[PDB]
Design a binder for this molecule. Structure first.
Ligand SMILES: [Zn+2]
Length: 256
């Protein structure tokens, strides 16, 4: 496979990673285009019952939770999606590791919930098509309290610490891993943030963060191993030039 930071650049092996409209990006809210057509996000089916369980796996680049069929997400008219999986990006002891930044600010970690457009039956058909995939992204920051929803996942990392290992977790309310404010977000068109870096992905970044305790953020960043005998840390791609793309905001943003 490929690696974060290490190895030689990605375009050597995956030339699409040198495309012009890549993710992640630095969001500057005062320069985002206010778009009142961007209405509150709509999710359904995200409150899962305890059974069947969900697969949780350390793939060497992140921890990835496989979602069951039936999770629906709507960005707007004509833009309906089904959720496939969620995974995270983080830093290290101290160091933040979100993928997107806000005015150059990097947050402790970031969650990505990846979705397939209802236009397509299979991910392979949607790759590279405009709108074929959509990601919901939220920043994770340090709060004073244990976050109970995340603890359901974070308490299971120790058992998948080795690269390639997997476990099963009870169904949970996936929407409780996301912010409560569905009305304020940024949206733009970019790419997958790992090879093959396919373009056409609609990114929606919540303005509101989710809060984890310090211990929880330490558990996320320090438990897993990656390729070789290396710790799975700092698993974020550098931000990419906008190259003339306009980031939209669903709310009046970046004032004072
Ligand atoms: Zn991601």
């Amino acid at each position: 496979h490929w690696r974060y930071g290490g190895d030689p650049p990605w375009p050597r092996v995956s030339p699409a990673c040198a495309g012009r409209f890549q993710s992640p990006v630095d969001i500057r809210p005062q320069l985002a285009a206010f778009s009142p057509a961007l209405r509150p996000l709509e999710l359904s089916g995200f409150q899962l019952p305890p059974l069947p369980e969900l697969r949780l796996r350390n793939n060497g680049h992140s921890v990835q939770l496989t979602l069951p069929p039936g999770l629906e997400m709507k960005l707007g008219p004509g833009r309906e999606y089904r959720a496939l999986q969620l995974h995270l990006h983080w830093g290290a002891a101290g160091r933040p590791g979100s993928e997107h930044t806000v005015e150059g600010h990097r947050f402790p970690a970031e969650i990505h919930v990846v979705h397939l457009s209802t236009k397509y039956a299979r991910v392979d058909e949607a790759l590279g098509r405009p709108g074929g995939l959509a990601v919901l992204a939220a920043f994770l920051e340090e709060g004073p309290e244990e976050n109970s929803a995340y603890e359901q996942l974070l308490s299971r990392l120790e058992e998948i610490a080795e690269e390639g290992s997997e476990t099963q977790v009870p169904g949970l309310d996936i929407s409780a891993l996301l912010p409560s404010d569905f009305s304020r977000y940024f949206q733009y068109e970019g790419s997958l943030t790992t090879p093959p870096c396919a373009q056409g992905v609609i990114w929606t970044v919540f303005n509101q963060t989710v809060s984890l305790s310090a211990k929880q953020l330490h558990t996320l960043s320090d438990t897993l191993w990656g390729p070789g005998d290396s710790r799975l840390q700092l698993n974020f791609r550098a931000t990419q030039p906008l190259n003339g793309r306009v980031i939209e905001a669903s709310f009046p943003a970046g004032v004072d």
